Symmetry: C3
């Protein structure tokens, strides 16, 4: 029994090391949007987390997070989006502070052949003085409290089939 | 209980099945045994792992009747493809209209002699219901009931070490 | 047993997903100090990288290391080797394996503040080395195959710079990939 469980834990860890951006891109699907939005309205600062992902194979380990009902200046009125640098297996091989351009998008879920998608996008340029980007060891989220308002999110296909797509594109 | 813990990992592995520059290579092992099973069970269809054409692309699945079906029954290998519901469907153009190239690979040492692959190409038919957006008649896929005859498959190295390779290249 | 069979099937599926990143495998060897002491006590003690495909539908390779050395490097050097393993796509490939291989022991220094001085060896696989031949049966069944460097880096040199950092070493194997085609 102990062997089968240690085996499952080993495979789960292996799967997590396979979470890697595609040309620096992570697309995070937040399902059950309708329910999760009501949970966030009942509990201020309830945060959703993406799976951890490597920017590129043997790169930085990052994690996207979202407040469906918002946080800080966006609390109760906006979707808020953040990213964090996590301790990664290959940190000693990397340049510090983390200084890669990060592009956040909330995807417009429209068929591109029928209508041009109108994604909500913002490009983050890390400040080398912010502690957030320093080598882990030697949370620290960085992002936007007012990414998209509750009124604006209903104006395009940002929510479709009770799901939203958050895109984080890291310049490699 | 653990059947679903294992099914969670199996589902994640399926999400990691992605074409290499739009290419899926599907190995059908135990050819002799499976061919005999196909002769005894005419509705016996082999399925490839499901795969994404590209990261965040269309989810497809290749299938084969080793003893053939329809007009190829008992005389040919029949090859088909289907669109399956994918996690990113709302981001894609519909109907699926990307050129698909099927090849049965000649397993000849390329350093010795030029392998003579058996190849067919098609542009997906917009009137084929399965090429339309999933969720929006026969359960059969789209393809070739007469891909290669049983006489031709025994020539060259189409069957080698009791295995055949099916290649499906999707124009990205 | 049914769940145990399922675990081994998933483990095989995960191995098929071990693919180099643009032909690159980076292998982290943790607990370096302890493993060096174990290797001093057991001369044949060999560390193995996970098996990996050079590229999707490519060659299956595996890197190996003797922390206390093998052959001419025994007791004085780290020895590095690579071998071809039976892969699912072997019958579609050119044999013998002839793609350029570059081995590196990584100097774990921040590249932005100091130039890391990696220890490197490059080679064009010799067509006469039995391992680089197509994998696969005779009455003689042994494991002596892999080509390499018995004297990759000396024990004196590995203690310089940042080759060992946080009790770990990084071994890099970069393999030459098929060239992309372009129509003019
Ligand atoms: Cl730092
Ligand atoms: Cl995908
Ligand atoms: Cl150390």
């Amino acid at each position: 029994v102990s062997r089968q469980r240690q085996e499952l834990q080993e495979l789960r860890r292996e799967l997590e090391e396979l979470s890697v951006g595609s040309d620096g891109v992570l697309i995070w699907k937040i399902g059950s949007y309708g329910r999760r939005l009501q949970e966030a309205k009942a509990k201020p600062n309830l945060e959703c987390f993406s799976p951890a992902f490597y920017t590129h194979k043997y790169g930085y380990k990052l994690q996207v997070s979202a407040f469906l009902n918002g946080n800080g200046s966006g609390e109760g009125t906006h979707l808020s989006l953040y990213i964090r640098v996590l301790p990664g297996a290959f940190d000693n091989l990397l340049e510090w502070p983390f200084a890669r351009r990060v592009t956040f998008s909330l995807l417009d879920q429209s068929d591109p052949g029928l209508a041009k998608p109108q994604h909500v996008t913002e490009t983050f340029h890390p400040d080398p003085n912010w502690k957030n980007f320093q080598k882990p060891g030697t949370s620290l989220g960085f992002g936007y409290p007012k990414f998209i308002s509750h009124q604006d999110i209903r104006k395009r296909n940002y929510v479709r089939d009770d799901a939203v797509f958050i895109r984080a594109a890291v310049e490699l």
